[PDB]
Design a protein around this ligand. Structure first.
Ligand SMILES: Nc1ncnc2c1ncn2[C@@H]1O[C@H](CSCC[C@H](N)C(=O)O)[C@@H](O)[C@H]1O
Length: 321
């Protein structure tokens, strides 16, 4: 589902600089990878590294500077040509070789690799389905005893109370300049929203719903279902549930690195994913709220996701893009 096709629109959006300007300007994201690599040179010095989805080539340059014997940087979009130029501009041609194409179909100049690095995550962590490609490369190229980074990730949910943001999106259509447009809500609620959540509006402790180990995880594990319980922290009206993720650099590290894309942390370009509830419900502090969430990829467009959520004995299916 992700090994075949093409996805024109997909690799075409990664052809322009804007999207890369945004990632590079994401300090939490970029400095986290820089610190990991530079602070654990033992992992790269004299090793062969593979950068899955190199973009402008930034991660590969970090590895080279750390001591990599050879780095292989691959990308399917046209941004690969601007990377060919950037590597030359920095005089790293004798260390980093570039290849244009899909990681699951191109021919590598080597058999196996010692380390694999990649920034493949999307909104709610799995949007875009790039982890599938990373797992593919892991199976075919990782040497026995090798490591993939970042190696561990997790996804969590948090209860929210914000009646004004709810009204702004839903109740709004009830009266537009004196006219009723209520029929519009039917197409608004089912859509998940990527946006920054005010930390002061969280009404429950966060709860983990997924754990991933890029060494033991498989492709089939990326479509799951999970029961969870949120422990209420405040007496307020629950209007929505927010999701986010955390990334970890751990195996063989003398200096471990971690970063969160949650509401209590510094903003990142990933923000947070919001599932508005059709019917907000009163919650009391100390209360325990049992729920269920199922995440599956759109069968018609494998890069998009489908989320089924149950809370307060009410179920709703949302779609992410
Ligand atoms: N199957 C695949 N094969 C090769 N490149 C892929 C891919 N799926 C996604 N990509 C590429 O991986 C990139 C994800 S963005 C990461 C870019 C860069 N490494 C950064 O850290 O700044 C995009 O350039 C996208 O085109």
């Amino acid at each position: 589902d992700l090994q075949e096709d093409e996805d024109g629109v997909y690799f075409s959006s990664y052809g322009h600089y804007g999207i890369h300007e945004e990632m590079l300007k994401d300090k939490v994201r970029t400095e986290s990878y820089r610190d990991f690599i530079y602070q654990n040179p033992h992992i790269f010095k004299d090793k062969v590294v593979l950068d899955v989805g190199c973009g402008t080539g930034i991660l590969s340059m970090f590895a080279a500077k750390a001591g990599a014997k050879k780095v292989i940087a691959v990308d399917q979009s046209e941004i690969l040509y601007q990377a060919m130029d950037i590597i030359r501009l920095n005089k790293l041609e004798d260390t980093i070789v570039l290849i244009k194409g899909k990681i699951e179909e191109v021919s590598l100049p080597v058999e196996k690799v010692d380390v694999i690095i990649s920034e493949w995550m999307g909104y709610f962590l799995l949007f875009e389905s790039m982890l599938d490609s990373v797992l593919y490369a892991k199976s075919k190229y990782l040497a026995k005893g090798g490591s993939v980074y970042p190696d561990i990730c997790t996804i969590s949910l948090v209860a929210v109370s914000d009646v004004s943001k709810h009204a702004d999106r839903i109740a709004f259509w009830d009266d537009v300049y004196g006219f009723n447009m209520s029929c519009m809500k039917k197409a608004v609620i089912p859509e998940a929203v990527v946006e920054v959540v005010d930390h002061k509006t969280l009404i429950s402790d966060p709860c983990d719903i997924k754990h991933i180990d890029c060494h033991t995880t498989s492709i089939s594990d990326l479509e799951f279902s999970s029961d969870f319980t949120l422990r209420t922290t405040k007496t307020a009206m629950c209007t929505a549930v927010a999701g986010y993720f955390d990334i970890y650099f751990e195996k063989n590290c003398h200096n471990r690195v971690v970063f969160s894309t949650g509401p209590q942390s510094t903003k990142t370009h990933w923000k947070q994913t919001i599932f508005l509830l059709e019917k907000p419900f009163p919650v009391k502090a100390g209360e325990a709220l049992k729920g269920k969430i199922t995440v599956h990829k759109n069968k018609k467009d494998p890069r998009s996701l489908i989320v089924t959520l149950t809370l307060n004995s009410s179920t709703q299916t949302y779609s992410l893009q």
